């Protein structure tokens, strides 16, 4: 099988600046003059892959002028002349010279924007869930940058660990921010034994705590 | 518009079977070679199989040989992948893709120009579990609302808001795998607080359990 290797694997870029992704094949992809059987694909978060470049250098339908492909034989390059927010996602090269078609590992294009503070929201467990004997308390961190932020759960001012899980969205195609959701899981009995539920969000010099009282 | 619509994914036991479909519209189906590509959870893209325009030639990844069969019904504009002797390694989103134009003796390649939306195959001995959908509501001028989609198996769950009419400011988060082996996911939206007294409904689809839940968030 033909092996495809991409470099780099992660690419952080400031909007407006150029980006370059290398793809190298283990065997020549030049079938004949002008026919390098090498494609480039973008996969945006939660979407199907989409064609950018085919046969080494040809822009596909609807692909902006900012995208170009070059190279021959074993060495290929995708260039984005000016990176825009909507370019965020994973970039894959693929050879179509021989079966099996083979892909590069993927390059994650990240967008380097200004620091944005999250909008923080806390949600109590629903009355409906409490009937099942479990309480999920949810904290939302909305539209922040950079990715690095810490959630600290507090129950009657006592620090919590090992009873929460969180996940983070991929970079937003419009504003280049992340969002985070954290769930604190307690038994109904433990939940009803305490009053103040607090989610503390730390980002650099700022900590923001949103809270609720169970009785209220 | 040239479009590919997929179906047939689900949860199966090891050694089980499943058939995937990929229906084409807005183009002459028989004029094009067709291709299956898969993506394992958190992984890259892997080629599975290709078929010529007529169906006369078929091509397979070594790991699926003797197990998978690619076929097509050109009168029905449909590409198939018969998946027998299913293995845990087959767990993936499966995409179909439009391949080389095949109305000349030698086909002409223009990339994999159109892709289907994907269909998910999960291979596990674990039973399916439908989700329990709970409201996320506060206990300011902008309010957040949401739904917590708890204790389901397997992935995936899709969430829309107001039957797809509400899209701006929607964040549907990656699921977490709980210690129970069940997934939990949240979906949120930010709305004006002034009009809370407007209806907001999350629409939660879980294909493997044949379950759709609509939850009005008060």
Residue numbers in the entry:
A (entry chain B): 1 to 216
B (entry chain A): 1 to 139, 145 to 202, 204 to 224
Question: What did the publication describing this PDB structure actually write?
Answer:
Alignment of a human Fab structure onto a rabbit Fab showed that the longer FG loop present in human Kappa constant domains forms a bent and bulging conformation that would interfere with a beta sheet packing interaction. In the case of the FG loop, this consisted in replacing the septamer human sequence HQGLSSP (positions 198 to 204 according to Kabat numbering) between the structurally homologous T and V (position 197 and 205 respectively, according to Kabat numbering), with the pentamer rabbit sequence QGTTS (positions 199 to 203 according to Kabat numbering). The resulting mutant is shorter by two residues, with deletions of histidine at position 198 and proline at position 205, and is referred to here as ΔQGTTSΔ (positions 198 to 204 according to Kabat numbering).
One is derived from the publicly available dupilumab (Dupixent™) sequence. The most dramatic difference was upon incorporating the ΔQGTTSΔ FG loop. Dupilumab parental Fab yielded crystals in 4 conditions but dupilumab Fab that contained ΔQGTTSΔ yielded crystals in approximately 120 conditions. The highest resolution structure for the dupilumab Fab incorporated only the FG loop mutation ΔQGTTSΔ. All structures derived from Fabs with the ΔQGTTSΔ FG loop on the other hand packed forming a beta sheet between the G strand of the kappa constant domain and the G strand of the constant heavy 1 (CH1) domain. This interaction is similar but not identical to that was seen in rabbit Fab crystal packing. The pseudo-symmetric center of this beta-sheet is between kappa V208 (position 205 according to Kabat numbering) and CH1 V219 (Kabat numbering). Besides the FG loops the only substantial difference between the parental dupilumab Fab structure and the structures of the engineered variants is that in the parental structure the heavy chain CDR3 and light chain CDR1 loops are disordered.
